[PDB]
Amino acid sequence: PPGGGEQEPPPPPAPQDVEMKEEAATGGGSTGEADGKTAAAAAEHSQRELDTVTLEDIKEHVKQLEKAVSGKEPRFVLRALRMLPSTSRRLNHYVLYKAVQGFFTSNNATRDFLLPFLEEPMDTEADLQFRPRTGKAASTPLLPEVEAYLQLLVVIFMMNSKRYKEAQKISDDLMQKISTQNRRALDLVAAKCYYYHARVYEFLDKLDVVRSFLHARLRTATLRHDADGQATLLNLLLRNYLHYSLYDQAEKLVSKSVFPEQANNNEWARYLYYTGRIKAIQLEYSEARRTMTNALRKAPQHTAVGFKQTVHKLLIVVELLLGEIPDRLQFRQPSLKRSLMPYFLLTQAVRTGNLAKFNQVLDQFGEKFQADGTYTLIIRLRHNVIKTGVRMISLSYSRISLADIAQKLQLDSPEDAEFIVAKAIRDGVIEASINHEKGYVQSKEMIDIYSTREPQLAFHQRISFCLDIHNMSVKAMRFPPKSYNKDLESAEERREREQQDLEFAKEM
Amino acid sequence: PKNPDLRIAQLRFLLSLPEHRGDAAVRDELMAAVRDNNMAPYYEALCKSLDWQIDVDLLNKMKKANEDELKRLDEELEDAEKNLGESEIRDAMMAKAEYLCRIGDKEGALTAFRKTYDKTVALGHRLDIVFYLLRIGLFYMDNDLITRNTEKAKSLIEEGGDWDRRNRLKVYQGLYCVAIRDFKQAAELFLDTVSTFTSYELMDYKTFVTYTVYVSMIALERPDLREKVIKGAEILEVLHSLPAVRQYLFSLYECRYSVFFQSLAVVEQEMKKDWLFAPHYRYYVREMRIHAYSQLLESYRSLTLGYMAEAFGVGVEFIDQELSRFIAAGRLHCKIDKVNEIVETNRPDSKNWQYQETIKKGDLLLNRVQKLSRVINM
Amino acid sequence: DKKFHGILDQGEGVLIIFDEPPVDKTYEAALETIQNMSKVVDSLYNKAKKLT
């Protein structure tokens, strides 16, 4: 009683204090300002909705003794929220349940009592036409059910609450989605429930019929409204099609909705990565690595970066497939160092010319690369290893026996030492001839690449590029020009006095 | 006090980084560490050190003496403000807040130093405060805070000449330019070795001489070496007492290549066991080898590989794998033949090599302004 | 000692003598501009990144 009675009564009111201001101003604002006049293209409860996701991902942790969220559910679910005569008592109903928490015991929502927290769209003049109020007031209880996820019999409460959310969702799919941002607002709520909706199904359920309903959701996307159903319904489509991909990729090649042309700086950003691994796994390398880089350079200034740990790895997987290699620990972190230990040692083996060193790493972290889901792409690097060897030696020495390079490259065979270098001429890595009769490999001294067209080519790749970044810094410089109202020439009365004094000076 | 203060950090190196070598450092570093009232900077060095649980009372008598100097600052700060000589509290801790810099940590130092910076209207104490901030920025290697007070430092010397505050400053920029791998600038700050002084931090002038020759032998070419270090009497008379360094310089200038690797292994070994050079000892000799290879190899065109083992340094397969990784490293301009046993050189132009670093900096700055270009405007 | 430059052959003592400064003035003068401008962009954080 002293520890509970002194440590337990302040967990209600200060979360009550913030929740009288976050979703009560998002409630008072998003209802009368999306279902109201308009939420414009510069919406505010979209990003306010982002804040009322991200604070709530890290807001609830405990099983909610003293009803600090457990009493928020029977408070915030009894809501007409119809108009100021009906919400004018709801503003008291934000406070009357605080007498129920502080004075009495409320309904402790602990894994059993969520079903009597659901049928309130029937209760007390609650509707569905205000789906700015009922999709936000659907999600706002749909989130903390699945935020902890705490998999013990909550999957069906989550599930049926997602079914009521699917009643609101299908009502958006068919019923008056125009000029209210019903569809435009609930694409955000659609994707944000597709995250938890996704991870429950990845946890314990199937995956493949929500694919078909997702094809219906994409079917009704792009037709009635042409934003954000074009965007999120393709990463959220992709997320296990990659993990169960094969030929479907060509569908994403021929997809019209590859571009939504705007995807709010993060869905576009991870989107270019999700399609980057497509060309990575289906062997288009050089086209992949530039959208790997472009997908990398569009991520925020936050620290929890596991997907950036993934793209930081895969981004130079394909560059190791292409021979070029930068340094990767130039921004190394305590969350990046342990996840780069093995991988920097892998590319350390690749940047050497040794043969079985590749095996000395592949036995060491082949299971780690299976845990990375990349081992079938790791396995093909020995081609690039022997290209590194033949380019290194062919550049270094000039007249060397073929009965030395196989032993130095531990090839165990000089009889195909003619043959790998033969495909180095077929690939054109080295030019000059092998004295196949004698045994030595001569190489000419090809110098003066300075008198070639190619340094102008390496220029011309970059001339138009830096002109384009100048031009985009010109097109993006058209947002400050405003409030240039009155260009007064000189005056009016001073012009009249100039006419008077000028008339006096001419009068003299 | 901050004048013997660098030997402390050098002996923190000598404690920590050589694994086997950790006994005399916890002898003499304790010998200086639980005397002259040092309390704060060796608790984590005590974690890296042994248990030393007996030193609790040693910490208590010295937090007691630290409390004594603290409380007599607290005895000075009221008669000091009672009659105003020149902000006499800060005239007390303009000498005793540097004690507090040694004794306490950087914080009670820094607020008393940025505090006391506004007291002396002439820079004759300001620039000494800035020197103190330079030295503690070196100790905690505050590589951003040294950039501030180097500029704020240099902004004060132009009024006056203050060459005992400018060449003395060039010692600091020399030690930072050799702290980083900026050697052609490090010898350039180590240019004079004449106005340089019998220091508090290099109490051997001759250790400063060894430093400036070790950075000069990479930093400058033959014309410079064949006039500057070879004809300087002031640089000659101090390596006159050096048996190895005079040999190690003259083995390179006098084409004594075989012993040059021996003395090279000596100086590289001590450099491996040296503070402030142990960050770049491998960087040093990988430039020394390719430097000597450039020196001998850029004389002849048809000199064979087997010639160099007996006159240059032993190991034919060593010269094989050693030049092979340097041509393969894209430097050391020659082209070796193998199965007729001859080494051939060429000469490249100053075009493609000078082109290379231009496309490097162009791609680097393109990455920079591209990244910032995505940083601004969402 | 680079006061004269050329080559010296060992088999019979041949001195191929050659001289031209190809281009010296251009790429370095265009090069140090780049490292000025990099410092300028580093200064653009301290009026851009911290500011807005």
Partner: peptide, 30 residues
């Protein structure tokens, strides 16, 4: 390549000069 390299930096610096004219005008005027 040098001139085209510097020109974009010029326009970038001007865009900084415009966003300072935006962000300290929207709150100030209202």
């Amino acid at each position: 390549y040098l001139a085209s390299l510097i020109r974009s930096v010029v326009a970038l610096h001007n865009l900084i000069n415009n966003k300072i004219a935006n962000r300290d005008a929207e709150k100030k005027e209202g």
